[PDB]
Symmetry: D3
Subunit: 251 residues, 6 copies
């Protein structure tokens, strides 16, 4: 139950990711064999729930690609449920300040370090109590990644970076650019400046910066600035754009 | 992506609806061909979730009947998820005051007009970014309908009617009659008086009144008073009552 | 595990049925409480399979209405699977002659009386071996109903009626009328004469006649003539027609 | 719609239960025939939602074993949805004080006794309005069981026990032991003392004590102290441990 | 219910297709908007059944792309079920001779032209009897495409082409090359010669030639030679290859 | 894609199995971690289909336990579909003679060795063409196990054993005992003698004998006699019996 994604971030090894919004355990398996370091199962902007996350985790399990799950909100109940089906790395949207970052961390840890509810007999996470000393080992293998995606969050970044347990800070360019008045097109200089400055500042604190960006030149630029978990495409986009291009070539 | 239901309300064209509680994409398609102007996919009182709403929207799509979705609560996260799978007209239950009405409206609009989270690459709503300028066009095609269904809500109706974005106000007779002490039988004069007075007052403000009522004589009465979205039956009731009547005719 | 539908046929008590083509465990429960003697889960003309049959059987189980299942064909393998999930009354389509009727019967019976495969530990049918002596008790509680639906089958009816274990013979007016050259018009005199004559011949042979007909006056005629399992409507039709009529009353 | 589990608790008849975390309507039916007085469908620590609770309720319905449902949190919206699909006995986790206990009770009662939303036409709970006077009969057949599972909750137990509507108080040893510093192993004397003292105090108030414990000797000890709803095993554990033992016997 | 794909073939307008093996109603909708003339829902080599075909048909329905369905075999019972859920264009695998081609045709036609079972009240195909005179109109809108995939089938092609109701003949290069002794290598000259010769012979007979080929230059060659329904890619391949290429660009 | 189960049989290493009839990807994972050498996904006597087989294969994949799949019949089309979703070891029921054994083998092999249909781009089996030279490597990793379950099959055993590609012969005691006139009583001496003699004859022929038996002492006897794939229990039974025993210990 060692979290290899978390260890890679701590070691400063960049992790290249693909976003999964197709909400299918079948396409998840297909994509798990494609060579990515990590895969993001999106519970916020794709039609997923705890049950479909579970089946996508099962599909991905035998592959080297490591699963990361985004809940629909920073909700301790939903987080509890996602952890019990076996989620170990969480990307929490709309984290606005250090209190919310601490709340996210706490939701993933058993008492006394947090408020995670105990149900190990029932949980895939413990392999239904086959993992010895699961309750004592689980906290240290949780990896908490918080999203900053408003001006307010950017303003609070220094305090967020002081939060123990926050392993990574992810910048969401679509939401950020919308909040900045450039809906939701992040290519503007003002947005790019905020993004790049945040990446530097995050890495400086010893935490992992992350981002999703479909422009490959920008992705390489962010990696050069020290980003450590960079998602470089989205399954729905890859499929749609490839299919459209193919159809157009035949008139 | 023009919202034809919203345009019809704004033009003062009454829209006759059927409530869908069978929670099936198959019966939804069957009913989408029955001649109604709108269909209510009930996420509050039928066993639906974001995923079953999605499949019912797909089933209904090629028909003239327009889908409306009721979330289980005025919850901005659930609303975000329903909008991304393509919901454009929302019926929000238990809206008690103008602050809650504003919250409902805000949940459906991208910044700066609201707090809707941005995820268009992943969303059926944008057809996975095939709709050009989706982010700039979406806000104006959202139709927000708020339910008033307690004495408190009735008391706050004048302020609710002053809320920009609130396109329609729906009176829920079952909940209202229960709150008034007539569980949950709305046929009482006191309940009927509150309902009819609200319909007049709503229409007077330039907003659309709505209601669900299975009594067809009452439905016509509400239409005559100026109601513009009137659901006149419920799928589960139509099926159950027709089947029971049939069985009884054969002993 | 007594088959009460079968006992009722044997005692000459007419059983009034409803056809289920909505393929949903949810609407199946709703309809199971409507007062019918039997409900037909249609695996031939509705999108059902062994798994959805199972869930509909579970939904119907606590109600007095008895389930009957129609497989897609007289296929011993499919019949084996349906029986193991708990089907005890089968309506077999397109039975053309006595050999095929015999094969339908043999598919439902364990050796030496038939060729039913043994898997009792796994089967809902035996309640996972909780029913004592299931293997010795099962054969006698199977009820086999065969459909005669062509001119060839009508010719062979006397031989079909002589087959031991054929408990009932069902006339399919839609298929029969199509085979006779009157598609969509079983109301034609030559078709009605064939149907009436078959019903009388079936009953005079000491077996149960059955039919589906949505015209309530014809249903009553068939009951008078001695039909013992008569389906008097179809869920999809009841729902579609009630909905369409409702919408039409409002324009 | 009489709640027989609730009546048994009120009569002081101990009820022996099994926990269901397999989240399957198929295994639920299999286990419903095993002889337990009650079955716990776990929406907090197993991958269930309103829809899978519904199908497990349908599967269990014809058996003598009575269903109890645990929502993922004390959330009035989720409770509303669970009640409409037919839940009558609720086990509410993490109830910390008397205000939260009152909130749980209120969520299950129609006005004026509570805030339960009215949707009986659509609800399996009313059998789609077949149950006469459902709205007037429902409140009295709801059975509310609250979980105490922290030191804080134990401290507030006397006030919780004064709450009308609270029919039972369940002690959760896994969460309690974790909160007490013995994650999450409850066998410690300190934990056992808190548990046994609570059982006595609960029963003394005229309310039903409950607990889940897989150690059968402890279960008998709790029953001897006056516990009235005792779950004595968990489906996932029974299956896993039996399978592991079997494999080990063959090397 | 006009079959526009069939009318296009008859008019000699080439139709460009994409193969759907992702077996998801969600990705089917995404791809239905990509601009293809037709989409092949594969029931032979992807994990589909009648029920998933149904949901994909519903997803595709509002788009201009026309659905074609491949059953797992030339099986009249399976074909009956696919037609009733609304399939009008069928691609039948492993058609070896004229007798088998005739049987494929007869499976799609109501008596006296064929053996299609009648169940219109239940069928999406008739929109549950909403389409007037469905039974008299259906036969003419069925489009039957037969696959020639072996040396034996190539031999029998002239007789297959003489079968009335065979609208198109599709060459399966993967199966054909395997049968010829070049598995996985349809690029071999002897295979290409067989394919080209078949396409010309099919077209000269006044029928539509079809093929699937992922090599875009070969596709263009086949179109030049007169192929009228040409699938130019496969969803699983498009997705897998785009993802793998992306991951490789970042290491 | 090496078949380790097949290699183990060939090397004479006995493989201990558990039967899976719960038809759930969730319980399949739970059981995949219990330490068995193989797990039988039963498509004959449990409510499975190609799609649920797929999800169980995905669940089992990261564990050391090897999956074996039983189709509902010796049906080449069904076998094609099971192989494409990734099945490499097949247990074929009711194989009565050498011709049928040959047909089972041929269904699993690409031409010229067999009649397996080619669809590698679409198949999980080839990991969507990621496995290089899949088409040339697949045949050799198929493992075909045939069931002898009647007196006729026992007669033909010597000829069945002479069929190339038959890797193992499994004796089905429930079906065999029923065919011999001892339904539900394979413990009878004449049945045990037939079983023992078959096991010895199979092994002496250089092939693997198999059987399912829930009596652990008989299992050990069969292993001593040289059986190489022995299933020693069934998930539904393990669960039902453990639950019933538990409930009985409390009254
Ligand atoms: Co964002
Ligand atoms: Co209401
Ligand atoms: Co028929
Ligand atoms: Co707890
Ligand atoms: Co082919
Ligand atoms: Co057998």
């Amino acid at each position: 139950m060692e979290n290899s994604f978390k260890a890679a971030l701590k070691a400063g090894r960049p992790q290249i990711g693909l976003w999964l919004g197709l909400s299918s355990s079948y396409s998840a398996e297909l994509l798990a064999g494609a060579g990515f370091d990590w895969l993001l199962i999106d519970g916020e902007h794709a039609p997923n729930n705890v049950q479909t996350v579970l089946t996508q985790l099962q599909a991905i399990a035998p592959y080297p690609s490591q699963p990361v799950v985004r809940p629909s909100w920073n909700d301790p109940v939903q987080i509890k449920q996602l952890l019990d089906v076996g989620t170990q790395t969480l990307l929490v949207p709309m984290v606005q300040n250090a209190d919310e970052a601490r709340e996210a961390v706490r939701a993933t840890r058993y008492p006394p370090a947090g408020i995670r509810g105990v149900g190990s007999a029932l949980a895939r996470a413990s392999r239904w109590n086959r993992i010895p000393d699961y309750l004592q080992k689980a906290n240290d293998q949780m990896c908490v990644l918080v999203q900053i995606e408003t001006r307010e969050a950017m303003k609070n970044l220094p305090q967020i970076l002081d939060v123990e347990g926050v392993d990574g800070v992810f910048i969401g360019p679509a939401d950020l650019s919308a909040d900045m008045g450039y809906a939701g097109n992040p290519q503007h200089p003002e947005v790019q400046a905020a993004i790049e400055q945040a990446i530097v500042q995050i890495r400086e604190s010893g935490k992992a910066p992350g981002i999703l960006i479909a422009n490959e030149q920008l992705a390489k630029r962010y990696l050069e600035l020290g980003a450590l978990f960079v998602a470089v495409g989205v399954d729905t986009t890859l499929l749609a754009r490839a299919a459209e291009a193919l159809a157009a070539r035949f008139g």
